[PDB]
Ligand binder design. Structure first.
Ligand SMILES: OC[C@H]1O[C@H](O)[C@@H](O)[C@@H](O)[C@@H]1O
Ligand SMILES: OC[C@H]1O[C@H](O)[C@@H](O)[C@@H](O)[C@@H]1O
Ligand SMILES: OC[C@H]1O[C@H](O)[C@@H](O)[C@@H](O)[C@@H]1O
Ligand SMILES: OC[C@H]1O[C@H](O)[C@@H](O)[C@@H](O)[C@@H]1O
Ligand SMILES: OC[C@H]1O[C@H](O)[C@@H](O)[C@@H](O)[C@@H]1O
Ligand SMILES: OC[C@H]1O[C@H](O)[C@@H](O)[C@@H](O)[C@@H]1O
Lengths: 240, 240, 240, 240, 240, 240
């Protein structure tokens, strides 16, 4: 049968999302997070297969939902979460590449700000440079959580690209020269939306591939990296 | 268990896609298309929930797969289809809004070229204007199929935006002044990738909403529009 | 003596242009077309030497006029034709270069859309990518006319440059990679003006030079190519 | 019969142009200049109707040729003149509009530099601002010639637009605020080409229309303005 | 007499700067800081009046130097400090305006990242968006120092403009919508230079003026704000 | 004690500046100019160490003040001079590099217009190319003064960069190809401000360094070049 749609992309009823949300690109990973780390969990969205869930982590309300790939996709889901669902804090949890000579596969990267080759932020600031900037309380909560768990982290800039299959000569060299630590596809679209709503966002990623040396984490290594990163993010939500 | 991954985003084995592929944003709609219009069908991808299927339509090999929302998402899937899976023709089948005073909800729009607010095409052509242009044989096959089915069509330009939740003053007025017939989020990313691979692409969409008058198709009207559009696209594949 | 000027650039009286117009860059070629293919012909413009003529082709009203070289020049003449002279359809008939490895000197190219290094289309669409797109009925009429005449054609993208004497490294390689078939100087300015007026435009060109291999048509070869192209265009006007 | 073509656009033999050339948009005006002010005159180009002539003014070699409308057109002709024909000095002689509150119809404007909405100069200077700048000796020769003839002049910036039929809100107000004295379509393309060849250029125009007040010179007033301007330019060539 | 110049703009000998440097725009304020907060102090630069000093704060080496007004000025001085003088950490200490409805005159703002209307960061990252991002350890040291001193702070984005005397409609509204807390002229040029050198930077400012409400701190209020901010910065250097 | 501030950056009382002002980057050089060439001199500004002075040169009122380094710095000081202090004419007197093969160290360069990599002029002219253009009477006064003093000059374009420490491949080659004679950091910001106020500006510089050949003037050679340039500028003020 037909269900009421609070947004064109989300079947959750208003109020069905907690004020704090973790988001990852893969909806199947959102389900894994819910099934393994949330209690009191219920599925709240199924539209487009973009699974979302709401429950608790250590008693505190927490939701987790997929965001798909790229800035336009996360922008739809995050705009709706902040606007319609009255979410206050989103932490993107993801994987990334790196070009930095001192960042290695399996490293955990906490993002302070994100560059991009998208136009979406120029369009928000009269064509000027608008830094997609993580909220400091969120960054700090991630840093402090990792410290308490004795998990080392890299803290610094990400670069969110519209083009996974890059053909762009000189890009990697410039990213490395300025010590961008993470290359991914979404965080630069998230932070300005949080700003618009007077809300908060951050991002944490694990390095799956070194773009320069060609090193790549195995499936088991990616699972271990994910377990470290997700525990950092979950513990951080208790501070937010 | 773990399966071999021919790409990071697709579990299909090389050869598991037909040379002709229909793509829509919603993977659940890809499943509906497969279940109702394909024979000899098998599911060939499940990664990220982005369902894809291969079978036949009236005996001719045909695949259907979801592409997600926005240019970066379709770019990943389409690049892989043309490159790794050796696809020759992709037709995007979707829904759209319109601003044009003479285009109405439920109309079928066949896209000849697509504008965009993305930077991805400037990056391919030394910063210049690169029109995302549908292949003429594909456009013609869609037009002729609709004529044979006695289904009226609008033929003309689309506009692919990175931002579903537009805040941009004057955009709708400019799109209307120049008679853009469809507003959507992906086609401008598809056509240049087809060009790169010496392959073909097109797009057909049904109008779900009039952005100016605020008219909106009901669920049943959207189903009827989808049935008209999908039959046009399927019959067109027989010519391609 | 002094004559009334309906525009600053055209001495034709309102009504002196047919609803369908062929335009070429060289006004002396416009005169050749009129003298050899039109009946009932009269010269209707002489301002700036930009000869224009109105008569009939196989009984149907048809005009032919020069447009000069480059986007700003065609923009003046075409804006006036659509606005003041109430023209409905303009077909640009021209010559072009090519970089595509499978397009050859003397080939006839029918343009579906045109890229450019001009800013004129960004200025029309809030700085975004606005594809200069030929009207589908015009493209189809050209394609079908060539088929009936048994003249092979290439159908695809043109690139309209402001700079005949290019010094731009990498441009030809990018145009070839994305299979632009024609390099010329005007069509990208024509199509958006037709859009503004709710009117129609297209373009057909013959390849005079291969920019990569350095092949070049002789004067006699250019005359033969012109005869093929002009017959296609004239027959197409009967369908428009 | 067929004649040798030193360029694709000019039938003049190498050496047939003097080192100093006046250019105006209208080839019929080039003929008027030759017929009324040059001695020893011969027509040296007829291609595309773009008449050009070479003779003497007060015994000194001088050529005059049309350049057509817009930056791409003047760029073709001027590039060829400096490169193939070894011209040293080009003075553009034209008409213009004005928005400046203290510039009036029939005023003579001597151009020191020209702004533009074209991309051609960004493409020459790595995307940066490259001022299209008149040569100082040329500007000074025009100023001093007008002084000797007791003809008042305005000296300052022009703006060269690609779009005669402007739809651009706020442009006139900005041009007026910064005291641009002349609005025309070509000079910004001429000066950088002179620079490339280590050569010289300038521009002088008469105001035919006040864009703000709507005043417009009659045909007779335009003839008188032209006579003043052309005498200034001709006398200036004796100093160059 | 003439002294050796290690850079064109700085008479300090290599080694004469500490590894940690505070910089403010006004060199006379650099002198005030040195005279009132440093021990073991010596003047190390006088070129262009851009006073710089080196001494200790609570025993730890610390320098303080003026940077002048605007991105190009700070870029010269900071590039030299990181490159020639082997500085590791620069904290910019300044004043700012605000547009944010919840930021007030006399507030202390700690900058996490800075937007800009300059092109300098696009030029470093292939024309893309490169966020000028403060180092997290520096931000944290400033935050923790203010907490220990019981001084409230605002933490968030700055905007560095090239134009003190703005005429730009809509800028303040956009800055407020996205909750930029500080409007100043230099920090966006500092952070990318620190990145290039593998070094660290941050910025702290006091609000002298509310751009919207027109409130303005008196000289005495500015002195009190400066005393709070400088103590935070000095204590932070002990952690860096 | 506290003094009244007519601007945030200048302690001069309204009326304390002459209508004609020389400006140089280094305030200590402004003091040298005042002390050695002005009579009736008084210091009128000390804020930020940006020394300014007013007196007479050969009996005519003249001021001299530092402007600091870069477009944003000169923009502050010059905007205030034209607006608050009612200055009519500013001549920037400076040093520069050159890339031109025929310009040599110690040459005096008189600037007719200035290119830039700044965005400040695009922001004034709706994103278009706005040439920073010197006033012709000022240029002419400088040229004629140098002639009377028998000092050779180069007259032509400058390029004002935001980045002293360039890392930009191909920039020098392009500047040389188009015969830019002076590379400096401020003049492109000055001329448009003079335009806004209906006032006049110019620039004269001496070549301290050849960027290509690596030649560099010694301190004594720079003093001699400065003496030549300053005498030209001072004599020019008598004509303005
Ligand atoms: O975690 C999934 C990962 O998938 C893709 O590579 C992109 O969408 C990344 O931005 C994202 O982090
Ligand atoms: O059909 C689904 C529809 O969904 C969204 O609105 C966008 O992704 C469109 O581009 C697409 O057509
Ligand atoms: O046909 C003439 C031909 O001339 C020039 O090369 C350009 O104006 C082309 O765009 C045009 O096609
Ligand atoms: O003189 C002719 C005049 O014609 C048009 O208006 C444009 O080409 C101008 O730039 C030119 O000055
Ligand atoms: O502190 C001085 C203050 O001066 C000016 O307003 C600008 O240079 C600011 O960026 C700076 O903060
Ligand atoms: O004269 C001083 C000189 O200093 C620096 O190099 C820049 O500010 C130049 O623009 C200026 O000319």
């Amino acid at each position: 049968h037909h269900h009421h749609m609070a947004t064109p992309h989300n079947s959750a009823k208003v109020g069905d999302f907690a004020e704090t949300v973790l988001m990852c690109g893969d909806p199947l990973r959102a389900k894994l997070i819910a099934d393994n780390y949330l209690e009191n969990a219920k599925q709240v969205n199924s539209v487009r297969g973009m699974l979302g869930f709401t429950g608790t982590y250590k008693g505190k309300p927490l939701s987790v939902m997929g965001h798909g790939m790229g800035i336009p996709s996360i922008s739809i889901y995050a705009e709706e979460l902040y606007n319609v669902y009255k979410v206050k804090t989103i932490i993107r949890v993801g994987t990334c590449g790196t070009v930095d000579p001192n960042v290695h596969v399996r490293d955990v990267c906490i993002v302070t700000a994100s560059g991009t080759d998208s136009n979406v932020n120029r369009m928000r600031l009269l064509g000027h440079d608008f830094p997609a900037t993580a909220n400091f309380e969120v960054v700090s909560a991630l840093v402090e959580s990792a410290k308490a768990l004795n998990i080392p982290t890299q803290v610094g800039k990400a670069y969110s690209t519209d083009i996974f299959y890059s053909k762009e000569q000189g890009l990697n060299e410039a990213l490395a020269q300025y010590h961008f630590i993470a290359v991914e596809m979404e965080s630069a679209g998230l932070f300005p939306i949080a700003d618009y709503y007077g809300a908060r966002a951050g991002c944490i990623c694990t390095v799956s591939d070194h773009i320069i040396t060609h090193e790549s984490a195995t499936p088991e290594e990616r699972q271990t990296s994910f377990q470290n990163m997700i525990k950092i993010a979950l513990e951080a939500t208790l501070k937010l």
